[PDB]
Amino acid sequence: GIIPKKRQELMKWNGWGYNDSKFFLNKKGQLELTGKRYPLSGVALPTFKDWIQNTFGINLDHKTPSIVNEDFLHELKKTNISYSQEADDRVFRAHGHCLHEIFLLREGMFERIPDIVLWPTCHDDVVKIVNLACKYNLCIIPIGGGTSVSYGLMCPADETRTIISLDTSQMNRILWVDENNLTAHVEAGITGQELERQLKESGYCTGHEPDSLEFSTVGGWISTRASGMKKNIYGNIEDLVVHMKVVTPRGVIEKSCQGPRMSTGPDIHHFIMGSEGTLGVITEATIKIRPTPEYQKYGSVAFPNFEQGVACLREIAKQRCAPASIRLMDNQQFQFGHALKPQVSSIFTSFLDGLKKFYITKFKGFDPNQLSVATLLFEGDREKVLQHEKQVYDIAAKFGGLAAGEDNGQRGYLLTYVIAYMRDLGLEYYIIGESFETSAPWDRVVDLCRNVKERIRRECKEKGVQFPPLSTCRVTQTYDAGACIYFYFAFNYRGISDPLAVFEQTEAAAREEILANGGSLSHHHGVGKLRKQWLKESISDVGFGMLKSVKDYVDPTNIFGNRNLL
Amino acid sequence: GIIPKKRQELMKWNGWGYNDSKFFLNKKGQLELTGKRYPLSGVALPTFKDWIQNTFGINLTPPSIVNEDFLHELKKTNISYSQEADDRVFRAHGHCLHEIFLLREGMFERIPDIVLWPTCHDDVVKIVNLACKYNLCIIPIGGGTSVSYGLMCPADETRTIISLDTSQMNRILWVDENNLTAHVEAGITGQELERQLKESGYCTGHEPDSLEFSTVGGWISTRASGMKKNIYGNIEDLVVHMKVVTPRGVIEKSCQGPRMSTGPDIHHFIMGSEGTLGVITEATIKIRPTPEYQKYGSVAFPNFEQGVACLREIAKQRCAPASIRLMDNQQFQFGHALKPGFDPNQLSVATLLFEGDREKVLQHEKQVYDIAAKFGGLAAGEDNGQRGYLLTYVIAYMRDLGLEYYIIGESFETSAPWDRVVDLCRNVKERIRRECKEKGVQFPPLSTCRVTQTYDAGACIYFYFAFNYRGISDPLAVFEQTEAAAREEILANGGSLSHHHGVGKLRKQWLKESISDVGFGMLKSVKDYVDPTNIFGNRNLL
Numbered sequence A: 001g002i003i004p005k006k007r008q009e010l011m012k013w014n015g016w017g018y019n020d021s022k023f024f025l026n027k028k029g030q031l032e033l034t035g036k037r038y039p040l041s042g043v044a045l046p047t048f049k050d051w052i053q054n055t056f057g058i059n060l061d062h063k064t065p066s067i068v069n070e071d072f073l074h075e076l077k078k079t080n081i082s083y084s085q086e087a088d089d090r091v092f093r094a095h096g097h098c099l100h101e102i103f104l105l106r107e108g109m110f111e112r113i114p115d116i117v118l119w120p121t122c123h124d125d126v127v128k129i130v131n132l133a134c135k136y137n138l139c140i141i142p143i144g145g146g147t148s149v150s151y152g153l154m155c156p157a158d159e160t161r162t163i164i165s166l167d168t169s170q171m172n173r174i175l176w177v178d179e180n181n182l183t184a185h186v187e188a189g190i191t192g193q194e195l196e197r198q199l200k201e202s203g204y205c206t207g208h209e210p211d212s213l214e215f216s217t218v219g220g221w222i223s224t225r226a227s228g229m230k231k232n233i234y235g236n237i238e239d240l241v242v243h244m245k246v247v248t249p250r251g252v253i254e255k256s257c258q259g260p261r262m263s264t265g266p267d268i269h270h271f272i273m274g275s276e277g278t279l280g281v282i283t284e285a286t287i288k289i290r291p292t293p294e295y296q297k298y299g300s301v302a303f304p305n306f307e308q309g310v311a312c313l314r315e316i317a318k319q320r321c322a323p324a325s326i327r328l329m330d331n332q333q334f335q336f337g338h339a340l341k342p343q344v345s346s347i348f349t350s351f352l353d354g355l356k357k358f359y360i361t362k363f364k365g366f367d368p369n370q371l372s373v374a375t376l377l378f379e380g381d382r383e384k385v386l387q388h389e390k391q392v393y394d395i396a397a398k399f400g401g402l403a404a405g406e407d408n409g410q411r412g413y414l415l416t417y418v419i420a421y422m423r424d425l426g427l428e429y430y431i432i433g434e435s436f437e438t439s440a441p442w443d444r445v446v447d448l449c450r451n452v453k454e455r456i457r458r459e460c461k462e463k464g465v466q467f468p469p470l471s472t473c474r475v476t477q478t479y480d481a482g483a484c485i486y487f488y489f490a491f492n493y494r495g496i497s498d499p500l501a502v503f504e505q506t507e508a509a510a511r512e513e514i515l516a517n518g519g520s521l522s523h524h525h526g527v528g529k530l531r532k533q534w535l536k537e538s539i540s541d542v543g544f545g546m547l548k549s550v551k552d553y554v555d556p557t558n559i560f561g562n563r564n565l566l
Numbered sequence B: 001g002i003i004p005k006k007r008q009e010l011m012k013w014n015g016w017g018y019n020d021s022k023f024f025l026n027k028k029g030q031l032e033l034t035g036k037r038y039p040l041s042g043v044a045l046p047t048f049k050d051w052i053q054n055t056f057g058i059n060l061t062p063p064s065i066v067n068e069d070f071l072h073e074l075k076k077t078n079i080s081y082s083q084e085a086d087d088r089v090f091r092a093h094g095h096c097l098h099e100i101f102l103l104r105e106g107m108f109e110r111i112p113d114i115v116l117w118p119t120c121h122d123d124v125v126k127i128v129n130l131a132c133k134y135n136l137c138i139i140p141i142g143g144g145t146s147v148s149y150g151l152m153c154p155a156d157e158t159r160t161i162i163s164l165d166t167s168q169m170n171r172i173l174w175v176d177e178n179n180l181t182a183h184v185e186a187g188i189t190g191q192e193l194e195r196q197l198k199e200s201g202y203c204t205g206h207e208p209d210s211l212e213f214s215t216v217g218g219w220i221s222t223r224a225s226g227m228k229k230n231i232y233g234n235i236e237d238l239v240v241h242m243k244v245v246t247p248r249g250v251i252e253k254s255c256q257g258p259r260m261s262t263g264p265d266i267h268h269f270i271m272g273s274e275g276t277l278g279v280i281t282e283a284t285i286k287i288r289p290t291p292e293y294q295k296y297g298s299v300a301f302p303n304f305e306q307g308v309a310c311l312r313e314i315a316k317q318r319c320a321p322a323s324i325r326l327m328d329n330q331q332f333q334f335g336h337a338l339k340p341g342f343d344p345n346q347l348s349v350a351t352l353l354f355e356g357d358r359e360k361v362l363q364h365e366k367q368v369y370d371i372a373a374k375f376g377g378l379a380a381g382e383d384n385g386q387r388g389y390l391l392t393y394v395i396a397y398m399r400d401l402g403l404e405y406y407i408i409g410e411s412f413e414t415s416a417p418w419d420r421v422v423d424l425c426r427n428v429k430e431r432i433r434r435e436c437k438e439k440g441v442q443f444p445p446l447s448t449c450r451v452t453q454t455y456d457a458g459a460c461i462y463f464y465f466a467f468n469y470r471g472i473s474d475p476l477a478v479f480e481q482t483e484a485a486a487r488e489e490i491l492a493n494g495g496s497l498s499h500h501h502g503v504g505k506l507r508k509q510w511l512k513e514s515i516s517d518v519g520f521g522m523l524k525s526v527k528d529y530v531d532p533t534n535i536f537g538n539r540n541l542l
């Protein structure tokens, strides 16, 4: 679970995830995932090829130096801090996981990359590096897991200083577990996977489960205001983090006491949370923990349509009895999920006809090209969980909801960690895309989803895309005041002059549409360098200027020079 | 429900609360509260005189300095204002003991020069532009309930001080039943906000003990906590949007998404800012349907320690009801005295308030008493539960009672991790006794605590300290000293500087240790950007 220093040894140098895990055609011409990492790994998906071909109209056969100061260098040796000027170590840490970046990793090259990589192993190391960076006028860009989807890691082209990629992966210990107060103090480089694993050996968990938890780190979560799948029980990162230590050019930031709630002026933890590497390195953090849940239970519910589903989720929110996780997928995602089942279709009956017949006895009177499905996960004490399950199934019944089986439920949940591997699959077959998200008030969700989807159609048609894009959404989180809506956008770029440009423009147009329908700039992805142009409008000129005042104070010479946010 | 401009029409000029409400000796020589405003108004308290006796051993104006070019321009706005002494003196203080003395017995070194009463966001915008133009100081005031010297005019401040009174800026602007939010002007009081919302079937459930007078804007500025925070949250959970007038301009996010990732959260730059940055003029607050049913409860424990463990367990299982409070023996005996085997001197008591749907309430109630039985806890009745919660809003009236019989005191609070709670309570208590004997207090002071909020990582501990000062040379200086010492003992035993009261000017000397030098400095950089000429010059925090 520890990220090794030469990452490409275990991880794909040119896309998401582990080397051992990729989609391939098996000996029977069926898509399948290699390796044994996931429960879907090594499982034939016989209907997946057909769903891809139907959805995108492709056949699926035809395919696609280090400038550094010597005095600094000499001083860095005294430290014993491990470092590297190797091109592959630098290029690996020159990007996150936005589409354009993955393309420059593949057929091309980055304009700017880190000049050198350092691997601090403790808070004190980080202090020395930041001291050295003051002394030699270095730029620093921290990296944890490298999972940013906001251009949060890209080196600005015109940065002339020596860029240090300050890799926190080796700074990864649980320093203490306080069982009395239910907190764990950890180093910021620990990955979510490794954090839960170790805590579990003591009987504990954080329950903070973002989809990137295999590689995303405690310090990255804090930096980007990360959200996890089980936020309803455990909180998002701002509810979970109770203390932190941050190294800035101006000094260390750390509160004295760990009183559970304070009134001592504006809460400085929130100046840092969401700071996106522009202020310093978060080195250690104290995070709330919980007894590992005794029992988990999956479920799923089908509704006549998306609108009915949304209203049910709204009512669940209203009664404040959301489960650990509830997600409502639109019809396309329901069909996609059907397209991963193991039943082998006759080549003479369409996708849609097997679907209709499959759900004819099961979902009566439901239109199969209109229906939507909520997946559900419950956890806690068995007796509590089962009580709560009945409560939730009884509310959903009032919106036309029909219980669709724990199997759909469990399936949706496992699939979450494998979806990110589909980009690479898509890329080999001229299919590009990206996920994006917003949060919106309850009263805007249905119109927002509908208009955002239709904006994507219109803009793809107008730019020359030959087939109507995949354009699907789901509701991933509920709150009192609204919801997180999460979208996928994908298309075949065959015929297109400049496919990245077209993706670019269409993703911007979507964001315009989102905001115009009362949605937020971001729910959890952050701003990075992707959404800077809307920031001022979203937080106000004065709010923007207050962010700048904190930045100019703690980092006056702009050492933490990723240029995210401002 | 609206506070009148001449507040002394309705509220005591020299102390807490309403003119119609004061404790007195009734026709049978029993203490009782005047008026009909509270459920204990007009209810005789036969045993409270005995308690006071056993416990304390007693038997029972400067001119308005203001520029005329400013004043000439104020008249064009039609914003209501006063330079009258009694309007300025009412707004020169909140509710710390030394303030209550200068108010009664003498005078404040400095008071506001003019009181303005804006009615809306645009009025406030004009006030702030006028203050930029004529170089004035603004100290916002809402309910005047600060117990941190957050309202005190600094003595050496020689600019005209405007008391910017928000009480006429007090309507609900809209209630969004789809999103369950309520967008309000920031001067609305808690009582008036809950009254209006209840006509629609809704509540915020935010219930500070000061709710009759304290305001949405005050709450946000002080990071206020309320009695049913377990269900509804504290103010930082409740607020979804705000509009703020600073000298640099208006702070306002441009969308009501429930949760964002758009950098460091700017609401938290203003929440807790204590009137040092601008005026909070409007706020959106989460609302909920009014709960259907409420029930009180109480549990007796063999000692305080068992009590604390039980509440730790209840927190651990995340099954706290609306309110749960644990009282030490001395507060348990105080309650017993105020009605209309197990060791007597050690036995402690938790009061409970459950609310929501009737059948859910009863299941919850069973779960809680079950958890409690494991720590020796015995159900001790609902009447008990109720009396404690009724008392909540009368205790503030006991100050002015006490001051008639040479008894002075104050309450104070901290938050602390679970495993510091028991020792912090014992040590803080003992530290007060020690300080009181060393300073010449005839009788051992009243020194009680209770645990008032529980959380994942710990609890809120609320203390009362009171003593008879008959015979003491400088009894305010002794109290001041003994308060300061109990805060040192709090900080030394793992406690925070403040759970909810805040910092103002009373706890300023400890802030830098608490938040670190770089933290402090971050706050100063925000202040200097937003308010470069320090128009918001109350000098709280920094």
Ligand SMILES: Cc1cc2nc3c(=O)[nH]c(=O)nc-3n(C[C@H](O)[C@H](O)[C@H](O)COP(=O)(O)OP(=O)(O)OC[C@H]3O[C@@H](n4cnc5c(N)ncnc54)[C@H](O)[C@@H]3O)c2cc1C
Binding pocket: A016, A096, A097, A141, A142, A143, A144, A145, A146, A147, A148, A149, A152, A153, A168, A188, A189, A209, A210, A211, A212, A215, A216, A217, A218, A219, A220, A221, A222, A223, A224, A225, A226, A227, A228, A229, A276, A277, A278, A280, A281, A282, A283, A420, A524, A525, A526, A562, A564
């Ligand atoms: C497949 C996939 C799934 C995802 N799922 C989710 C999800 O469910 N929820 C969610 O919120 N996000 C998700 N993300 C986005 C991303 O994982 C988060 O933003 C995450 O919090 C970043 O973690 P990281 O450790 O990879 O940070 P990195 O990507 O390494 O860095 C992100 C930012 O923080 C800075 N930074 C990193 N570490 C530190 C530190 N210690 N101190 C200061 N600054 C630092 C960097 O400079 C950069 O600006 C996902 C991304 C991918 C690619």
Ligand SMILES: Cc1cc2nc3c(=O)[nH]c(=O)nc-3n(C[C@H](O)[C@H](O)[C@H](O)COP(=O)(O)OP(=O)(O)OC[C@H]3O[C@@H](n4cnc5c(N)ncnc54)[C@H](O)[C@@H]3O)c2cc1C
Binding pocket: B094, B095, B139, B140, B141, B142, B143, B144, B145, B146, B147, B150, B151, B166, B186, B187, B207, B208, B209, B210, B213, B214, B215, B216, B217, B218, B219, B220, B221, B222, B223, B224, B225, B226, B227, B274, B275, B276, B278, B279, B280, B281, B396, B500, B501, B502, B538, B540
């Ligand atoms: C009897 C009693 C009981 C109390 N109970 C509680 C309790 O249960 N929980 C709790 O948290 N606190 C409590 N307090 C403390 C106090 O009531 C709170 O801090 C409250 O939030 C202050 O509200 P207010 O409207 O009275 O503010 P004020 O006392 O008017 O002002 C407090 C500070 O806020 C500033 N301010 C006021 N309004 C604005 C505005 N619109 N914009 C900018 N700044 C502004 C002022 O300058 C001052 O610095 C209590 C106080 C008393 C006397």
Ligand SMILES: C[C@@H](CC(=O)NCc1ccc2[nH]c(=O)[nH]c2c1)c1ccccc1F
Binding pocket: A097, A149, A211, A419, A420, A422, A423, A424, A426, A431, A432, A433, A434, A435, A436, A488, A489, A490
């Ligand atoms: C899964 C997405 C590509 C993508 O957006 N990857 C990054 C990613 C994956 C899963 C996530 N879950 C998130 O909350 N943010 C995420 C970000 C995708 C893959 C192939 C085609 C289209 C497409 F949108």
Ligand SMILES: C[C@@H](CC(=O)NCc1ccc2[nH]c(=O)[nH]c2c1)c1ccccc1F
Binding pocket: B095, B147, B209, B395, B396, B398, B399, B402, B407, B408, B409, B410, B411, B412, B464, B465, B466
């Ligand atoms: C009740 C207090 C006086 C006091 O502290 N009033 C202010 C106050 C009242 C109730 C509160 N509830 C709070 O949470 N903070 C509070 C602050 C008191 C009165 C007489 C003698 C002693 C004494 F401590």
